Amino acid sequence: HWGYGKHNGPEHWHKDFPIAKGERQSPVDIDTHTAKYDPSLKPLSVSYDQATSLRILNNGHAFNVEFDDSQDKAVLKGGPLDGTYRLIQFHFHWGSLDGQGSEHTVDKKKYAAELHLVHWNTKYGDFGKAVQQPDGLAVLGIFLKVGSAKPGLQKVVDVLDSIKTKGKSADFTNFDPRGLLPESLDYWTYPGSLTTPPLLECVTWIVLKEPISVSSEQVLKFRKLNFNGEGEPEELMVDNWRPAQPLKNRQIKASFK
Ligand SMILES: Clc1ccc(Cc2nnn[n-]2)cc1
Ligand SMILES: [Zn+2]
């Protein structure tokens, strides 16, 4: 029964999930002046040409677009990563207003939303196994700022009223996640965690420097979703973001000078 409210939100999660106060928790503030350019970071390889999207689901915390990860169809490699990481799903975190929503912050700036493209290390064979490993997942985080519409997000936006409430899903085949990327693949990387329970410390975070622009109308539609299931009182799905957590003994590395 965790969520994002006063009574079940992030400040409460440590009671059920004491790793909440662990040593490699996410998200973090990315201090752009303290992150170090790491000349040894291989270039990042996002190969999504063959991606097979399937379904879009409101799970009561976010909306998830799910992909067929039974084969190496959409993968992430290179940059900080060893081996191959297979795309399983993406989702967003967003705010009730344009000035908040992202999980990661950049010199304390909050963006309106944050996209997470979630990949698991194929050497651990399934996702469940991967989340039990320090290098189990690689999450590609991309900030959303409000400006001009993002055309490759609109198929997402346009379908949301079919999954208004928790537990609703719809067919979402033939969606190409490459349309959600910015131009540049410059990134920050650091070792961290899931930003939701169970908060496992199993993520290599890769956060793109260049945000994508989305329109106000686009993000507005995210905010019309519901945390609640159908035929319950309406709690709008907003502010599903965890605030920034202590960096502790970690370094954020930059791929760019
Ligand atoms: Cl499959 C999956 C993985 C992580 C999350 C939530 C999250 N953890 N870190 N960023 N988002 C939701 C679904
Ligand atoms: Zn997320």
Swiss-Prot record:
Catalytic activity: hydrogencarbonate + H(+) = CO2 + H2O; urea = cyanamide + H2O
GO molecular function, one term: arylesterase activity
Segments crossing the lipid bilayer: none
Effect of residue 118 to K/R: Strongly reduced CO(2) hydrase and p-nitrophenyl acetate esterase activities
UniProt-reported outcome of changing residue 195 to A/C/H/P: Strongly reduced activity
Activity dependence on pH, as recorded: Optimum pH is 6-8.
Description of how the protein assembles with itself and partners: Interacts with SLC4A4. Interaction with SLC4A7 regulates SLC4A7 transporter activity. Interacts with SLC26A6 isoform 4 (via C-terminus cytoplasmic domain).
The protein's name in its UniProt record: Carbonic anhydrase 2
Species of the source: Homo sapiens
Biological classification of the source: Eukaryota, Metazoa, Chordata, Craniata, Vertebrata
Gene name tied to this protein: CA2
